[PDB]
Amino acid sequence: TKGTSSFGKRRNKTHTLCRRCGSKAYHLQKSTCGKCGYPAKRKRKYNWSAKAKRRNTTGTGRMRHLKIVYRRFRHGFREGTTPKPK
Amino acid sequence: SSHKTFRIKRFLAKKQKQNRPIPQWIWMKTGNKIRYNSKRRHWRRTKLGL
Amino acid sequence: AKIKARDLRGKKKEELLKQLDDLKVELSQLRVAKVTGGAASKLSKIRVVRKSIARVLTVINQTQKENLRKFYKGKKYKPLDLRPKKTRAMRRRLNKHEESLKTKKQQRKERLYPLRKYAVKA
Amino acid sequence: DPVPYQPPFLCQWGRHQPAWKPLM
Amino acid sequence: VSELAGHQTSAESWGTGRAVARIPRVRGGGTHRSGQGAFGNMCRGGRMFAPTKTWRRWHRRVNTTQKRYAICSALAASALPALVMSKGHRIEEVPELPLVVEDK
Amino acid sequence: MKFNPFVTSDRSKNRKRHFNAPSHIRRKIMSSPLSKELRQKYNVRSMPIRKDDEVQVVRGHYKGQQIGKVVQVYRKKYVIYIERVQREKANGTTVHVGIHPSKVVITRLKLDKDRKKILERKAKSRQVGKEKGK
Amino acid sequence: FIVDVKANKHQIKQAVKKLYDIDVAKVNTLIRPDGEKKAYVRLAPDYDALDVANKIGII
Amino acid sequence: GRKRPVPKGATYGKPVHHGVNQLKFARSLQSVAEERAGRHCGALRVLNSYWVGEDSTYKFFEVILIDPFHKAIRRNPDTQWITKPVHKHREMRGLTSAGRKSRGLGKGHKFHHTIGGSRRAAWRRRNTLQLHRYR
RNA sequence: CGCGACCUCAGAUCAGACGUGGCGACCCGCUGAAUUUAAGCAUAUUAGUCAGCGGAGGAAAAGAAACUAACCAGGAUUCCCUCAGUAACGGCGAGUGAACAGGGAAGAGCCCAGCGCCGAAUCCCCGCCCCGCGGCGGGGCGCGGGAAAUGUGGCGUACGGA
RNA sequence: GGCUAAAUACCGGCACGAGACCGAUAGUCAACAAGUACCGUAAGGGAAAGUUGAAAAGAACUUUGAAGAGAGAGUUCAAG
RNA sequence: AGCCUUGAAGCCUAGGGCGCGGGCCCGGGUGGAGCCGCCGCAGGUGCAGAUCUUGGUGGUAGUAGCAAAUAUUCAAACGAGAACUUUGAAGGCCGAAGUGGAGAAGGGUUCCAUGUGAACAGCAGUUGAACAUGGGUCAGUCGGUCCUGAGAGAUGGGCGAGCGCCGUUCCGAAGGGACGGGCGAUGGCCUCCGUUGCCCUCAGCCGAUCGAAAGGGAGUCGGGUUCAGAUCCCCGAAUCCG
RNA sequence: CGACUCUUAGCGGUGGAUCACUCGGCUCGUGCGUCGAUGAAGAACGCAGCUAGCUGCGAGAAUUAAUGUGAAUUGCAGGUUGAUCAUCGACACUUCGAACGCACUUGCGGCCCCGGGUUCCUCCCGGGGCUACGCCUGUCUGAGCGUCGCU
Ligand SMILES: [Mg+2]
Ligand SMILES: [Mg+2]
Ligand SMILES: [Mg+2]
Ligand SMILES: [Mg+2]
Ligand SMILES: [Mg+2]
Ligand SMILES: [Mg+2]
Ligand SMILES: [Mg+2]
Ligand SMILES: [Mg+2]
Ligand SMILES: [Mg+2]
Ligand SMILES: [Mg+2]
Ligand SMILES: [Mg+2]
Ligand SMILES: [Mg+2]
Ligand SMILES: [Mg+2]
Ligand SMILES: [Mg+2]
Ligand SMILES: [Mg+2]
Ligand SMILES: [Mg+2]
Ligand SMILES: [Mg+2]
Ligand SMILES: [Mg+2]
Ligand SMILES: [Mg+2]
Ligand SMILES: [Mg+2]
Ligand SMILES: [Mg+2]
Ligand SMILES: [Mg+2]
Ligand SMILES: [Mg+2]
Ligand SMILES: [Mg+2]
Ligand SMILES: [Mg+2]
Ligand SMILES: [Mg+2]
Ligand SMILES: [Mg+2]
Ligand SMILES: [Mg+2]
Ligand SMILES: [Mg+2]
Ligand SMILES: [Mg+2]
Ligand SMILES: [Mg+2]
Ligand SMILES: [Mg+2]
Ligand SMILES: [Mg+2]
Ligand SMILES: [Mg+2]
Ligand SMILES: [Mg+2]
Ligand SMILES: [Mg+2]
Ligand SMILES: [Mg+2]
Ligand SMILES: [Mg+2]
Ligand SMILES: [Mg+2]
Ligand SMILES: [Mg+2]
Ligand SMILES: [Mg+2]
Ligand SMILES: [Mg+2]
Ligand SMILES: [Mg+2]
Ligand SMILES: [Mg+2]
Ligand SMILES: [Mg+2]
Ligand SMILES: [Mg+2]
Ligand SMILES: [Mg+2]
Ligand SMILES: [Mg+2]
Ligand SMILES: [Mg+2]
Ligand SMILES: [Mg+2]
Ligand SMILES: [Mg+2]
Ligand SMILES: [Mg+2]
Ligand SMILES: [Mg+2]
Ligand SMILES: [Mg+2]
Ligand SMILES: [Zn+2]
Structure with a gap:
């Protein structure tokens, strides 16, 4: 009775949606995230998890600040200057 | 669960709006490569994770 | 009329607020017309109203923040929004005068022994 | 419906099963 | 790869x-x-x-003397009449096969 | 050959820069030669076509000596539509047959201030090239 | 009405009172499975709901 | 000394690595003091440190920390190299003296294992095949 | 007991700044195996290697001898060819394994404490005026406030110096 | 006790250039809505999938069938 | 000075053949855009097997099977079409620890209406939890929110090369609170009081914080209303706290 | 000539092999070599007239302003004193997140200033600015049977 009859007792949840990585890997009893380690100040990443690196890198998401950092870098980070009006 | 939370209800609310199919004008464009919505989640087939 | 950003800059702030409120009433009426079922002229007009609201708020924000930096230009301490927002490692550098600050002994060396201009013969 | 997983392994003919045994 | x-x-x-x-x-x-x-x-x-x-x-890498021998053979076969046509060049109307032209 | 080490001589990259060009480069690519009379008059080899231009079709099925007005310039499919260059659908409606602007000659230009500025700038560059060649 | 989800009942009451110039008896809020906040604004009986609906345009 | 952080014995392997008690840490306790002070103060930067006292159970070190951000250091050209971002956390890379004494770097026949940049640069420079073009 | 200094230690949503975390191919500091080989295996080997940890920069590190040599002496560091699979290490088994010098790429040198001379001759912050203010700097005016003799600045550092 | 460019390294990022390479079971997992769909409580695992025509010119209209389906007619050089 | 939209590669061929052979060349059809001969060069270069990897398709085979829990019958309607849809009548079953009416976890639009019969519901369907358009969850009193339990977990401290770990009262100056009195400053018919600023004076607590939608926890019931919501909407009665 | 079975050929179906194409990879080389409390990487949720995914953006939400370009976007409707595109230097950038008022339920606070409420009279509502830890310089308030000087 370790299989089909024992699968019916699975209703209480241990993990839930995390609020830093977004994945459903936030354990409720230990109060920590198994994906990124949310109560830790640092991101949980490893070099044995080489494929799990590239799922979450800088090239993955939006880069809503880093692309305009690159755009300001390619003209030398000018600030306050305006082009010549008509 | 009838006892929902706001975060879980908002997460279900986004998926309920994603569950709708494509319109009929989207395959009349020039460079169309979409015949149908391939991300149609049914409530019996895929259980949304969790 | 076509609300352009050129004539919004010379006008007074209260006229900008009155035109903003008129555009908000116009947006609310077009949303009511969309939900009741309206004309495609109104359905294309709501985008023009949204872009006009964006233009009016942009001109208001320009006339606010350039006047604020004109006010805080002469002062030594200025707010963090008015401070120049560049990269953090470039903000945490040395100053231009501090990169030119040399010691007295190094200035004495540069005075007594400059790198001479010379050439040799074949 | 997604791709069904492969037919699972079932210890069918070990020492535990008396339905068939070899010469011992 | x-x-x-x-x-x-x-x-x-x-x-x-x-x-x-x-x-x-x-x-x-x-x-x-x-x-x-x-x-x-x-x-x-x-x-x-x-x-x-x-x-x-x-x-x-090739030895320098073998490289120079290849250059000398490639230049010396460019003077013989049969070896240039056997390369394939249409040279029937050329007045002299060591074609030396002025410095202009 | 090309001697600039930054100009691309790669087929896939040139096809990428062609078929993924923004609209101001689409206008630059979709240009058409002028007629012999307009070319002698303005000393301009070619110009980008506009909605209000006149066209003789040079190659294709609809070629001839028929001067037709452009309906509109459709830069997404790299094509223009001409007034009398059209065909009949099965149901009966007339659909303008698309012609690429490379098989298109201009008989009359629609002249605005920017159009005259581009023509004068191209004539000036042609005169500078002719003076440098002389 | 359909309301942004970040609102309060007092915010909906003062918003209806400032926009449409009408007094409010109470506000009942729910959040739809679409996501937006449906608001049943019970008015005072001195003004008519059908008259203010014909004023704003809905019918 | 530093003992091996394992459960009771249980270093799973060959009998070379079963040593746990008599192991020694590669850096000195003065450099441990420097890196602890520099980890407590990320803004302050370690210059060097010195011994003041020792017990049987403790040693005691004064670590000199410098602001790279105060004007008396920033406007002084003799110490403005401290204000440069290259010298961020010298105590971890081993750029202070107590860390440089643990690296085993120097000139001559007694320091062949750190010729080049460091010991790691020495090992990497020695363990490469220089597979040329024309060979 | 009261008042006033100094020394240690607190409390501040005090005035002005900084650090936290990310990427991590290259670089630095630790920590660190077992597969494998030795036709077994335990020293060795894989190997200061994989994994783990911390820290930056556009390079990092190193770096101007407590050096190499023993020659008619060379002369900071880094990298390449060669030394050289050599000297040497190793159940002297399996295997491991540099350095000097020579030819080049590059080449740039220096600063303190101490020892001493100069009325602390030095540094930070706040008030006013002028210039400039999108790398908050220069000069003048303040019986303004502090830091500093438990030592700031100038001359000066092994090539001698005063 | 301390500072210092240069020659040196770079399978991350931005902008590029080239190829005696691969040509949709190959080449990166991913030429396409690819770290996507989907699976596992989780750490993690992880696909398949290019080609009408030059131009939709994507088959008007008649007719059987409830329609899917056809039979004529029509477009195209070619609906083989 | 090779072949080619007056038809390249690929593919098929009861055709003509050549070479011992590996293989190759012509004829006919399809095809629509590139391809080959010779001298050299280079390799990811030749399949029948590896319980080979991927994809596809046969015999089995129209076969095994659609057999657990007693049972369906007649007429009418919609409809092209009815054993299964709907209504009426009859006969049955679950026989109040139910096949009934409601909740928790979980599911997430599955709830309701309209239309469809392309795909699914291992027969069918005019039907459905399927598909496509639209709608639906209204609270001071119902819960969460508050408290604490078993426990978890910061600060001080200790340990640790280090991310950090231990520890929860233990090597802590751990309070920012309030009665009264004095002083100056404001506000209101400066009457009299509140607000704040300083000083005197007073004070024990216990460990920051989290931790139960069944524990403790103030206070809402009756009637009516929707295709789908009712202690929530409407009416009539109350009631708790500030 | 029957049915069934075997072989070959024409044709038609299952299937997508071969060939030819390639807005894609792989490798090598060059220049630059820049993130973040002035809030990074990442995540969540919203934004289109008709908009699921992708892409882009942040309540100004498939974009605002400025410059250059010079008559379009387009799947369907709607409307030269500058449409659309690219550059982007100005403005703006919801909520988590180093994440910062304490917790992560979107819950509970505290201080100051404004508008309804008032006629400062305390609640209530709405808006705005602060309130994370460590550390550097200085300031203020302090403690000490620590070292002293005066009465
Ligand atoms: Mg559990
Ligand atoms: Mg880390
Ligand atoms: Mg299920
Ligand atoms: Mg000096
Ligand atoms: Mg050129
Ligand atoms: Mg061993
Ligand atoms: Mg070691
Ligand atoms: Mg150094
Ligand atoms: Mg030593
Ligand atoms: Mg402060
Ligand atoms: Mg860091
Ligand atoms: Mg062995
Ligand atoms: Mg063996
Ligand atoms: Mg063995
Ligand atoms: Mg070793
Ligand atoms: Mg490692
Ligand atoms: Mg950097
Ligand atoms: Mg350096
Ligand atoms: Mg040397
Ligand atoms: Mg040799
Ligand atoms: Mg032996
Ligand atoms: Mg070794
Ligand atoms: Mg040497
Ligand atoms: Mg001195
Ligand atoms: Mg020296
Ligand atoms: Mg020394
Ligand atoms: Mg030294
Ligand atoms: Mg080249
Ligand atoms: Mg494929
Ligand atoms: Mg394929
Ligand atoms: Mg293929
Ligand atoms: Mg592939
Ligand atoms: Mg592969
Ligand atoms: Mg195909
Ligand atoms: Mg054909
Ligand atoms: Mg055959
Ligand atoms: Mg073709
Ligand atoms: Mg090959
Ligand atoms: Mg085979
Ligand atoms: Mg049958
Ligand atoms: Mg049967
Ligand atoms: Mg029931
Ligand atoms: Mg029920
Ligand atoms: Mg239903
Ligand atoms: Mg069926
Ligand atoms: Mg703990
Ligand atoms: Mg609680
Ligand atoms: Mg409870
Ligand atoms: Mg194919
Ligand atoms: Mg395929
Ligand atoms: Mg949308
Ligand atoms: Mg604009
Ligand atoms: Mg413009
Ligand atoms: Mg709770
Ligand atoms: Zn997480």
Whole structure:
């Protein structure tokens, strides 16, 4: 009775949606995230998890600040200057 | 669960709006490569994770 | 009329607020017309109203923040929004005068022994 | 419906099963 | 060919029994690539036999005297009449085959 | 050959820069030669076509000596539509047959201030090239 | 009405009172499975709901 | 000394690596003091440190920390190299003296294992094939 | 007991600044195996290697001898060819394994404490005026406030110096 | 006790250039809405999938059938 | 000075053949855009097997099977079409620890209406939890929110090369609170009081914080209303706290 | 000539092999070599007239302003004193997140200033600015049977 009859007792949840990585890997009893380690100040990443690196890198998401950092870098980070009006 | 939370209800609310199919004008464009919505989640087939 | 950003800059702030409120009433009426079922002229007009609201708020924000930096230009301490927002490692550098600050002994060396201009013969 | 997983392994003919045994 | 080509997939072999061909197969999953076969040159996807390296001996050096001998032979055969046509050049109307022109 | 090490001589990259060009480069690519009379008059080899231009079709099925007005310039499919260059659908409606602007000659230009500025700038560059060649 | 989800009942009451110039008896809020906040604004009986609906345009 | 952080014995392997008690840490306790002070103060930067006292159970070190951000250091050209971002956390890379004494770097026949940049640069420079073009 | 200094230690949503975390191919500091080989295996080997941890920069590190040599002496550091699979290490087994010098790429040198001379001759912050203010700097006016003799600045550092 | 460019390294990022390479079971897992769909409580695992025509010119209209389906007619050089 | 939209590669061929052979060349059809001979060069260069990898398709085979829990019958309607849809009548079953009416976890639009019979519901369907358009969850009183339990977990401290770990009262100056009195400053018919600023004076607590939608926890019931919501909407009665 | 079975050929179906194409990879080389409390990487949720996914953006939400370009976007409707595109230097950038008022339920606070309420009279509502830890310089308030000087 370790299989089909024992699968019916699975209703209480241990993990839930995390609020830093977004994945459903936030354990409720230990109060920590198994994906990124949310109560830790640092991101949980490893070099044995080489494929799990590239799922979450800088090239993955939006880069809503880093692309305009690159755009300001390619003209030398000018600030306050305006082009010549008509 | 009838006892929902706001975060879980908002997460279900986004998926309920994603569950709708494509319109009929989207395959009349020039460079169309979409015949149908391939991300149609049914409530019996895929259980949304969790 | 076509609300352009050129004539919004010379006008007074209260006229900008009155035109903003008129555009908000116009947006609310077009949303009511969309939900009741309206004309495609109104359905294309709501985008023009949204872009006009964006233009009016942009001109208001320009006339606010350039006047604020004109006010805080002469002062030594200025707010963090008015401070120049560049990269953090470039903000945490040395100053231009501090990169030119040399010691007295190094200035004495540069005075007594400059790198001479010379050439040799074949 | 997604791709069904492969037919699972079932210890069918070990020492535990008396339905068939070899010469011992 | 890149060294990561084929080795990014984790695949343990199923062992014996299972009546499968004793190949490292993809560890589970509800997808098409699950128990399929990743490593090996004969499997679909994965790696190929003998990945070509960046440190192949691409360049060959020749002795300087052999290089100069090749230059001297290539210049000396450009004066004989039969060897130029056997290269293929239409030279029937050329007045002299060592064609030397002025410095203008 | 090309001697600039930054100009691309790659087929896939040139096809990428062609078929993924923004609209101001689409206008630059979709240009058409002028007629012999307009070319002698303005000393301009070619110009980008506009919605209000006149066209003789040079190559294709609809070629001839028929001067037709452009309906509109459709830069997404790299094509223009001409007034009398059209065909009949099965149901009966007339659909303008698309012509690429490379098989298109201009008989009359629609002259605005920017159009005259581009023509004068091209004539000036042609005169500078002719003076440098002389 | 359909309301942004970040609102309060007092915010909906003062918003209806400032926009449409009408007094409010109470506000009942729910959040739809679409995501937006449906608001049943019970008015005072001195003004008519059908008259203010004909004023704003809905019918 | 530093003991091996393992459960009771249980260093799973060959009898070379079963040593747990008599192991020694590669850096000195003065450099441990420097890196602890520099980890407590990320803004302050370690210059060097010195011994003041020792017990049987403790040693005691004064670590000199410098602001790279105060004007008396920033406007002084003799110490403005401290204000440069290259010298961020010298105590971890081993750029202070107590860390440089643990690196085993120097000139001559007694320091062949750190010729080049460091010991790691020495090992990497020695363990490469220089597979040339024309060979 | 009261008042006033100094020394240690607190409390501040005090005035002005900084650090936290990410990427991590290259670089630095630790920690660190077992597969494997030795036709077994335990020293060795894989190997200061994989994994783990911390820290930056556009390079990092190193770096101007408590050096190499023993020659008619060379002369900071880094990298390449060669030394050289050599000297040497190793159940002297399996295997491991540099350095000097020579030819080049590059080449740039220096500053303190101490020892001493100069009325602390030095540094930070706040008030006013002028210039400039999108790398908050220069000069003048303040019986303004502090830091500093438990030592700031100038001359000066092994090539001698005063 | 301390500082210092240069020659040196770079499978991350931005902008590029080239190829005696591969040509959709190959080449990066990913030429396409690819770290997507999907699976596992989780750490993690992880696909398949390019080609009408030059131009939709994507078959008007008649007719059997409830329609899917056809039979004529029509477009195209070619609906083989 | 090769072949080619006056038809390249690929593919099929009861055709003509050549070479011992590996293989190759012509004839006919399909095809629509590139291809080959010779001298050299280079390789990811030749399949019948590896319980080979991927994809596809046969015999089995129209076969095994659609057999657990007593049972359906007649007429009418919609409809092209009815054993299964709907209504009426008859006969049955679950026989109040139910096949009934409601909740928790979980599911997430599956709830309701309209239309469809392309795909699914291992027969069918005019039907459905399927598909496509639209709608639906209204609270001071019902819960969460508050408290604490078993426990978890910061600060001080200790340890640790280090991310950090231990520890919860233990090597802590751990309070920012309030009665009264004095002083100056404001506000209101400066009456009299509140607000704040300083000083005197007073004070024990216990460990920051989290931790139960069944524990403790103030206070809402009756009637009516929707295709789908009712202690929530409407009416009539109350009631708790500030 | 029957049915069934075997072989070959024409044709038609299952299937997508071969060939030819390639806005894609792989490798090598060059220049630059820049993130973040002035709030990074990442995540969540919203934004289109008809908009699921992708892409882009942040309540100004498939974009605002400025410059250059010079008559369009387009699947369907709607409307030269500058449409659309690219550059982007100005403005703006919801909520988590180093994440910062304490917790992560979107819950509970505290201080100051404004508008309804008032006629400062305390609640209530709405808006705005602060309130994370460590550390550097200085300031203020302090403690000490620590070292002293005066009465
Ligand atoms: Mg549990
Ligand atoms: Mg880390
Ligand atoms: Mg299920
Ligand atoms: Mg000096
Ligand atoms: Mg492969
Ligand atoms: Mg050129
Ligand atoms: Mg060993
Ligand atoms: Mg060690
Ligand atoms: Mg150094
Ligand atoms: Mg020593
Ligand atoms: Mg402060
Ligand atoms: Mg860091
Ligand atoms: Mg062995
Ligand atoms: Mg062996
Ligand atoms: Mg063994
Ligand atoms: Mg070793
Ligand atoms: Mg490592
Ligand atoms: Mg950097
Ligand atoms: Mg350096
Ligand atoms: Mg040397
Ligand atoms: Mg030799
Ligand atoms: Mg021996
Ligand atoms: Mg070794
Ligand atoms: Mg040497
Ligand atoms: Mg001195
Ligand atoms: Mg020296
Ligand atoms: Mg020294
Ligand atoms: Mg030294
Ligand atoms: Mg080249
Ligand atoms: Mg494919
Ligand atoms: Mg394919
Ligand atoms: Mg193919
Ligand atoms: Mg592939
Ligand atoms: Mg095909
Ligand atoms: Mg054909
Ligand atoms: Mg045959
Ligand atoms: Mg073609
Ligand atoms: Mg090849
Ligand atoms: Mg085969
Ligand atoms: Mg049958
Ligand atoms: Mg049967
Ligand atoms: Mg029931
Ligand atoms: Mg029920
Ligand atoms: Mg239903
Ligand atoms: Mg069926
Ligand atoms: Mg703990
Ligand atoms: Mg609680
Ligand atoms: Mg409870
Ligand atoms: Mg094909
Ligand atoms: Mg395929
Ligand atoms: Mg949308
Ligand atoms: Mg604009
Ligand atoms: Mg413009
Ligand atoms: Mg709670
Ligand atoms: Zn997480």
